[PDB]
Amino acid sequence: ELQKLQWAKQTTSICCYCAVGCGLIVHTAKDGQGRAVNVEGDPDHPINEGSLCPKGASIFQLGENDQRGTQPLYRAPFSDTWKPVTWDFALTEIAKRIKKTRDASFTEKNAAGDLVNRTEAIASFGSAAMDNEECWAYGNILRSLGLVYIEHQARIXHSPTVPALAESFGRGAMTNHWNDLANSDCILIMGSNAAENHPIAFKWVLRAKDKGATLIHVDPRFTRTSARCDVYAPIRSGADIPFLGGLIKYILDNKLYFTDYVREYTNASLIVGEKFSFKDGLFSGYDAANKKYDKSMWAFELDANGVPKRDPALKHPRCVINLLKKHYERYNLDKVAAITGTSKEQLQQVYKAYAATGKPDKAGTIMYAMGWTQHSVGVQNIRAMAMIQLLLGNIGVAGGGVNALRGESNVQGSTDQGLLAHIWPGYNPVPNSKAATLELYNAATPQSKDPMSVNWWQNRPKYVASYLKALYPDEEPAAAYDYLPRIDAGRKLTDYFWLNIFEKMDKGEFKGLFAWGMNPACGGANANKNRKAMGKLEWLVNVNLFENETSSFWKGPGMNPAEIGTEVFFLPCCVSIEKEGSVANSGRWMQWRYRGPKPYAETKPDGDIMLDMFKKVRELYAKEGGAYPAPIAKLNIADWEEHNEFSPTKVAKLMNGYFLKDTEVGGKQFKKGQQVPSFAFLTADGSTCSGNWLHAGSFTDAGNLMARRDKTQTPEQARIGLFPNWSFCWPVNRRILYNRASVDKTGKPWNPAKAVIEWKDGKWVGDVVDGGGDPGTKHPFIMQTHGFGALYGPGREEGPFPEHYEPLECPVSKNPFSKQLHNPVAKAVCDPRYPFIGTTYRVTEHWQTGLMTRRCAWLVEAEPQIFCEISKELAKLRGIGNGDTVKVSSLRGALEAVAIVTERIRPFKIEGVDVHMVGLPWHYGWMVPKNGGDTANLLTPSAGDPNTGIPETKAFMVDVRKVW
């Protein structure tokens, strides 16, 4: 027996850090009645097999931490101290601030007379750190209160992926999963530092290497990832599209594409209309006044029946594939080498190794994360990756896919629950002011007249209706539709996003902010601006594990509490191992975790905080009346609670959904109260509720499928590591999306040795087939209107093919590919006092703003202070020695850091000039620890994008000087 674990209860959990979703075992003292005594890896978990990086391995020190919040704290206007208060006081006063602000600000109809039923006086940030049931309940609370300014982390690192991959494949999701990396023949890591930022992923990457895979890192820096790859190829910041365009040209020139896959499964054969053209860096339909394209100019030639015309011979000059060859002919090795800074020898090595996966029985994968996809053409960067993967036949196959790595443990889930201004749960759009009825809302979904096109989104009315029945079960969906707020059709969508929330705050246009499980005082670009802007709030609610730079902005550096009138409520929440619920990892695995220790001191799970807060608002409206009470009074919160507490189980069952009456659907008879077995059985007529259609199948009459810990696999499942009986992934447990592309038109796998699905005895065997139907009877991309993987993607604002537009402004004045230098649908000063390219990135040992990991002595021990990584060349220029203190400065602010002089950073040659890159971690902040340093976001601009609404944190101009 081990004395340490004797007498302790063992429970399972999932890591609270990154989207790998590693399994934990928690030991809790007194047979579960005390504190955690140990936290380490779950040896039975199929993703980590008991392994943890230093963040997962230190969760004990995160949870059993005497610096954690113990109870609510209150900061009165102009006060220079916290007052400890009760939960009753804090939540009563918060409910009163919510009601007072809403009653004063609520607008039934906008200027134009359109119903909007909203308040623009309150905004919310957060959070990918909350459980799925909490994220879902939180969004519905905020929308029942009439909020539209609802944002979180996902806006920065997730949002560009969704439309790039949705355009290409029909869904925004990571296409494969972590274990599947072990099946790859060539792994291209580009815009990712996965060995540091998704560390257990390298278990599976190195297993691919063990089976003969080539590992390639393309990064401006040499990292801990680079150390363990076969090929490290340096790339100049923002030269990704040239790199990928050159790979597209290389594939087409050398005939390395998967001909049959391209012909059958991509839109290669579709005939583009004569109105499509490209000349001098501009597509047809360009409006130079409004800096916008008329995308109708890019339409396909339609046949008599409205179906895009196809030439299966691929001969017609307006075939997508021929337009593609013509577009990328400009990306020759010499030009690409010149702009990337990658040698022609290295480009040839990387192109040869990767394009070899165009063989039907070889699979290549691309891994990318946040990288530099922030800028205005990040969507087109990801589009180029998707197009390469479609040319090579790598989509739908084991070891293939676009592995768009999610950041946080539940950023997949928090996005799936619509904690972004433009989406409800399940990626149903937030109505705009012109969607006056539910019928008009539903009218927007494009139809297909191609009987082989599934066009699954035609089912959207069933999902929207079932969502409205989950919120308002006593109401007809058409009536409940009027309860929820609408955004203005007249405004740029980006007016409702992250960066404009900070801009509006700085203009005093918000009364109240929820900083719910985020640290915007450190995580927002241009921290000096945002910290000042927070002082223009009447009230701030911060829900968090620890006191932080956001909760305590009013006593931050250079702040006078006496001059700052913001009322602040700090509500301490409980750590992941102190609560039950689900988190959706990067591979869409919705994994259930359990309470180990009881909540520390008087901390509360987010679900209990938000529900008690909402119940108090509800009470106030019942007593006082006020602005349009219906959305609040009528919300179904009875289904959220059991034994006086927030019930993760009951919320998960509601999110799956259940029949509200006896119902016949798709041949079967269902009884009132039965769980919906899959989204295939949802109705538009009010017979069904479902909080999130993607969750229909996750918690059925069979029980909680997210809680399954069953490693049972068939030989074919085990060969590629599907683990279909381990937890549950949306949609309907399809582990590899687009898997109909992995077989020929008879249902025979392209690679039988790594089969994903196979037609055997009148049935699909292996993975769950992504779209029902006999072999050769359906287009494989069932979420696409037309059914095909899009090489040509005419829904994209920047054009239907990716094109190099310089995301660097200050050091570049020429575009080698056209006369169009910058994104023609997109105010940098480039002050010569700041000659270096500053960039921010992560280290393995710290998490995000470091709010969590700066409180963990073992992580501070390894990475105690903000550093500044520079080349030997820049060190020589500025007379900086390794370990010297340096001042890093920009137009936005200044900080001190320890110099790390390393050959891991080299100068870029840009238009014949040596340009130096300065590297900073963004994990530090003034609150903790002693001499840790402050946020790299003191330096970054709040200049982002009218397209994306995303700040520039990967390339911003700085100076660096030695301090004496």
Place this chain on the structure above:
Amino acid sequence: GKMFFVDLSRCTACRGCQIACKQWKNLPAEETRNTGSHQNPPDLSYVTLKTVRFTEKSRKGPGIDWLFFPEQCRHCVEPPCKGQADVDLEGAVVKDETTGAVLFTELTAKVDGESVRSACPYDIPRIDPVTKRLSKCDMCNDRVQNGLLPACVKTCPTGTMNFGDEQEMLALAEKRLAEVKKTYPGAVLGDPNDVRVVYLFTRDPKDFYEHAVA
């Protein structure tokens, strides 16, 4: 007896092993500062039994050779530390007969600590400046006796850390050396007949640390 096979060709310097060691034993953190390196703590101490040492080596063309060495007691088959301690007092350093772990006891406070550190050809032992007790890696010998992997082995995401019976681990080391040589032609095993912690170095072991090998 038991053996670690540490394949340094697979290490991402995640430092899971460094943290896992401290979590299992509830060891305190050192006061550290960045002096121009990711490496921290800079050395083994009374409260640090394992630290990942980082070394950057120049190479032709882009990037570097970045060498990572998670340092621990080698659990020597014939440990000089014990031979030296046994001068002053037997039972200060013992060998477990079942696992082959070399174990410092509370009686190390009575022996010449400075002398025991000097006897170690890997420079592993560390002295508490208060109690004069010696500390180092104890092979997680209690976990091992209870059929668990050592904390640093279980935590390792890459397969750098391997643990088992000496016969299976020597065979794994031989087989893995042959495979690793295909990528890193100058790969060697560290003192593989003398110790129970057998490192595979991708090149001259002394490039990883001056006491990488005896």
